[PDB]
From Swiss-Prot:
GO molecular function terms attached to this record: identical protein binding; magnesium ion binding; xylose isomerase activity
Organism: Streptomyces rubiginosus
A Pfam family per the record: AP_endonuc_2
Keyword Cytoplasm recorded: yes
GO BP field: D-xylose metabolic process
Taxonomic lineage: Bacteria, Bacillati, Actinomycetota, Actinomycetes, Kitasatosporales
Compartments, record wording: Cytoplasm
Identification of the protein by name: Xylose isomerase
Sequence positions that bind Mg(2+) 2: 216, 219, 254, 256
EC numbers: 5.3.1.5
Length: 386
């Protein structure tokens, strides 16, 4: 019955199930959760672990003694449940000081503060066992053109990430960074707006091996992009360090619906890809139970995230293992796609008359791809209509 267990590596942010329900037009609908209670409840649902922003775990502005107590209690909850903390991140967005950014704020003093705030939490993340440190630059960007010279901002972004890499390395930490792209919201346009832009930027960092992406289903869908395709490019680049799973009702504000909601077939093809490719990182839900819900609905929504992943995993595996699908994949030449175009090399290609003067273009054009039959097999498998 699609029951999650820790081995499935499902994780949740404190801020997900803990979202009190404030939106741009509405006050909170639920009380705040104690992180200890969330750890407990998520463990009971079959989660593997939790994640946190600094300011989710330790109230902003806490004293050193308050901070120690928050962490002690959290550690006890982890120990009491067997939950892990595979990822952490910094809140560089909520507080008014970050209104023009953290790492790319126009004010230099804010940029320096953002780095110090991040570094302090990297140390805590390492103490709690995190393997990945996410950065979501939600305030990096602009509403107007003159406000932000993007080349200069990218210089500042690179400087910041390079400093963080220097810091990790200086401490002998094994933690790696993952940039979580988003195209807009809360800024009118956000820098590094997609998987692609983040992947490209990483290639210009001093130590690129320390950085990957943390793509989010809904964020790429806010640009109308194909999330599975972007994940495939991240995997191709060796950069899928972490992933955020949720749902999104098309090109709108970031909804953060439970995984499986929104574009269901994209969720199917995503799970197919992650499982086929042997992705071994967390299956992290960056979601928000809708503010219509009470706490029973919070936990139902969280459970549904995991359930939907597991249903989709079953159906994708059945699709790939079905003889009839394997035949259809050959009929559609997915086998040829995986073979080199020209392992014979350039000169041999240039000398091959079968590739040009004697290529029968009309006969090749007439060969149907058989993609609709393949896709209806995929649909039948998804729906359990085999």
């Amino acid at each position: 019955n699609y029951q999650p267990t820790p081995e499935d590596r499902f994780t949740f942010g404190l801020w997900t199930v803990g979202w009190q329900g404030r939106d741009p037009f509405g006050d909170a609908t639920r009380r705040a959760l104690d992180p200890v209670e969330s750890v407990r409840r998520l463990a009971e649902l079959g989660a593997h672990g939790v994640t946190f922003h600094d300011d989710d775990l330790i109230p902003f502005g806490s004293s050193d003694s308050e901070r120690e107590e928050h962490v002690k209690r959290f550690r006890q909850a982890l120990d009491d449940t067997g939950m892990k903390v595979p990822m952490a991140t910094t809140n560089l967005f909520t507080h008014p000081v970050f209104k023009d950014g953290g790492f790319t704020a126009n004010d230099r003093d804010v940029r320096r503060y953002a780095l110090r705030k991040t570094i302090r939490n990297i140390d805590l993340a390492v103490e709690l066992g995190a393997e990945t440190y996410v950065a979501w630059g939600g305030r990096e960007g602009a509403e107007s053109g003159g406000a932000k010279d993007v080349r200069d901002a990218l210089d500042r972004m690179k400087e910041a990430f390079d400093l963080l890499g220097e810091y990790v390395t200086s401490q002998g930490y094994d933690i790696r960074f993952a940039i979580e792209p988003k195209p807009n919201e809360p800024r009118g346009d956000i820098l590094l707006p997609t998987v692609g832009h983040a992947l490209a930027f990483i290639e210009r960092l001093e130590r690129p091996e320390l950085y990957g992406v943390n793509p989010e289903v809904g964020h790429e869908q806010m640009a109308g992009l194909n999330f599975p395709h972007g994940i495939a490019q991240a995997l191709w680049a060796g950069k899928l360090f972490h992933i955020d799973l949720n749902g999104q009702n098309g090109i709108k504000y970031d909804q953060d619906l439970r995984f499986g909601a929104g574009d269901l077939r994209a969720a199917f093809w995503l799970v197919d890809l992650l499982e086929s490719a042997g992705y071994s990182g967390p299956r992290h839900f960056d979601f928000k139970p809708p503010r219509t819900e009470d706490f029973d609905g919070v936990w139902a929504s969280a459970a549904g995230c995991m359930r939907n992943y597991l249903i989709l995993k079953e159906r994708a595996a059945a699709f790939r293992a079905d003889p009839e699908v394997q035949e259809a994949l050959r009929a559609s030449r997915l086998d040829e796609l995986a073979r080199p175009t020209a392992a014979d090399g350039l000169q041999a290609l240039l000398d091959d008359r079968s590739a040009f003067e004697e290529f029968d273009v009309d006969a090749a054009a007439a060969r149907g791809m058989a993609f609709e039959r393949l896709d209806q097999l995929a649909m039948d498998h998804l729906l359990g209509a085999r």
